[PDB]
Amino acid sequence: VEYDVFLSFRGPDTRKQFTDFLYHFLCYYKIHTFRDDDELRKGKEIGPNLLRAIDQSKIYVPIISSGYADSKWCLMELAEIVRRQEEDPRRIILPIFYMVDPSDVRHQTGCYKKAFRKHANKFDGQTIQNWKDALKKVGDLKGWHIGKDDEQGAIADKVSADIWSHISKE
Template identity: 55%
Template sequence: MAASKNNAGSASSSSKFEVFLSFRGKDTRTNFTDHLYHALLDAGIHTFRDNEELLMGKKLVPELIDAIEQSRISIPIFSENYASSKWCLNELTKIFECKNTTGQVVLPIFYIIEPSAVRNQTGSYSEAFERHQTCYDYTTVQKWKEALREVGSLKG
């Protein structure tokens, strides 16, 4: 993931983001997330979001990891299909790690989904994990579930 070319700058190690947005593009990119992103920029808040040019791979790219680590606040936007994306779950795992190691502030948003569905992995989240368990190792899936449980328990 790379930061948008406009006011967000780039995700280089010299950048410092105030906010990192984690979201499932097909659910919220062109509506809620876009409005939130522009409102943050208009308020002068240096915000990271991907620019739809994500190169698919198994691991989070270094720029994405740097953006998460350098952000003071992370905002995961949980939506119906968030848990179906390994990218979203990997981002959330890194966000959860930063929350616990550096005290990063995490402000979850529950977009047309109940917090309990995220926290308890029910509904579409349960279905996503049924698929993930056939494709990914036990440890990875458990890390994703733990991150969802913990971050899903935060007041949104």
């Protein structure tokens, strides 16, 4: 009755081509999947919406993209996934990289440098270190890379069963 899978993604980059091609496919395997479309902004961290599904979910599946470093809601929300993970390691994380290399995620260089070049003029001098030391550890787990050739269809089918297999076999 509660949520079992919680997603997360960029705003406009991958909201209507691959993320959607997954959520529909997942519902055809009978598992209630939670994704949110309201941009929040009504504060700094809303209550019984995001913060509800975070502690209720089971298998966090963050979909890092190429511009995932700009929207200040995304990072400081991901800093809550990996922080809640280190408390109880019973739940897992299955990142799915996208277009970008799996080397510009462990050092925030390359396509992210312009992002943290302007985020350092507004926020604290230590909060930024709280994002990087949390964004880095995500780039060390397992994950399906998707180059410019891989057919963005079977990857969805191959990655749905790997999420359903942790439900039937328990």
